[model samples]
Target chain A: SLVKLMIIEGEVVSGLGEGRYFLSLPPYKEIFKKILGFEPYEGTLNLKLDREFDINKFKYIETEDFEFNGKRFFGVKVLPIKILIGNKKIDGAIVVPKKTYHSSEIIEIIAPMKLREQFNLKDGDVIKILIKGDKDE
Target chain B: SLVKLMIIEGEVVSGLGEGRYFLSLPPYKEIFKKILGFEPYEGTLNLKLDREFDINKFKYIETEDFEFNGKRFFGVKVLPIKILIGNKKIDGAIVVPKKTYHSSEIIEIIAPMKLREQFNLKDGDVIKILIKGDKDE
Candidate 1:
């Protein structure tokens, strides 16, 4: 079945700095590059989601867990979407870590560049995500 | 190919009473029920469409021309879409007559009920149409 184009809007929020550390890992960066065809910036744009969003319900890009320095890193699910920030649209994806403190009301977005700097965004700034995913899970 | 959910907004307008006379025909009513699973109301809600739309570029319900009471009539093309009026969302279809004076900027909508009285609408009232068409032409 086809999933309709989803309109996911949220306000910008500060992250816990975990995204930077995880994304900076060489292996993790390669995973994003291979799946999404872009080298993600060394962090994610955390969004305080506005509505009910079930990340597990749609088709996703699977990133398997692996041991990066003795500790097993969590797998991630990437849902490709288009980000609309300040009238500019960019190719991006929503990141859902297999294990994380981010609640269902929050989501992490990954783009080729640092969206915060590119869009001059700050906490409380609103943005829109258009999710035209291929299939329904 | 897949067509995304099209958001077509328009202002409500009065029709020229032709829809009532045409829809009162028994054969035409049968066509609506056979294809859309509902008996359409006597007339259509004429919409001054807000976006550029090509009626022939999407999959449409074919209404083949047929003789009725010894006069030739125009067969119409129907594109099944959902109509959003006020707080109500109903199953409907966009009617594109195979031959008519209605421009591409204007479209006719048919629902199971009279959208005008049901929603207490008047000229210049805005409504939205959601077209999740299955295929592209």
Candidate 2:
């Protein structure tokens, strides 16, 4: 079965820099590879929305719970999203910790490669993306 | 019951408007009253999505096909949505038609009160719609 395209527009933003530490952690790292089809870059690209959308409606490829060190983390939803920028299309997944440093309007993106400099995107550069849903290979 | 929310954001529109007629008329009313726990308001509040979503995705409360005035209304679903605006909130249900002239982007809202006068909402103003799963009462 196939799904229709869902366009989500976001303005690029900066985050607290913890995603670099977090994504490189053992728990999230393995899950990213298993679900997103790539081992995520050490950090994340943050994007800002004007407001919140129905997160439950768009579709997430994975919903995971993890424990690293002595801390338990629950509620992370990831949806694969493809971005059309400059001369290329980059593969990434939109991430929601369900618990995060920023507000819900700002979400994190994890990709196999570093996205910022590669895409020439600076803070406030709007990213145009269509969310990709998971289907059988 | 797996309760989740579908947050819908849209501009409130005056139809070229209508929905007050059929929903409040007869057939759709009582079932709504039965399923939604309240008799629907006379008309509907319209919201246009940024683009479109898979109408097939999220869950709905009820699907009742009934006849009135020698006409048939088929493929209709109702989902409970609790709306938030300003400092106030009101609970209502969204009505979706499997067929309509408008873009699939349009969704009709049915409730017990005239939300406009109560909220003093204008056509272009944004209203955040919060929908949850069917049970847990």
lDDT of each: 0.81, 0.72
**In terms of lDDT, which candidate is strongest?**
1
Error of 2 at A1 (Å): 26
The weakest ten consecutive residues by lDDT in model 2 chain A span A128-137
Which pairs of residues have clashing backbones in candidate 2? B20-B42, B20-B43
Query: Proportion of native contacts found in each model?
Result: 0.12, 0.00
Candidate 2: tens digits of C-alpha lDDT, residues B19-46: 8777656777777888889877788998
DockQ of each: 0.09, 0.02
DockQ of 1: 0.09
lDDT per residue for candidate 1 within A86-131, as digits (tens), equals: 6789988999887665448878888999988888888999888888
Instruction: Write the residue-wise lDDT of candidate 2 on A1-137 in tens digits.
Output: 11334456788888778899888788888888888788889998887777664456665655567677888777587878787665577788888766555447767788878878677778878876666432321
Off by over 4 Å in 2: A1-137, B1-3, B99-103, B133-137
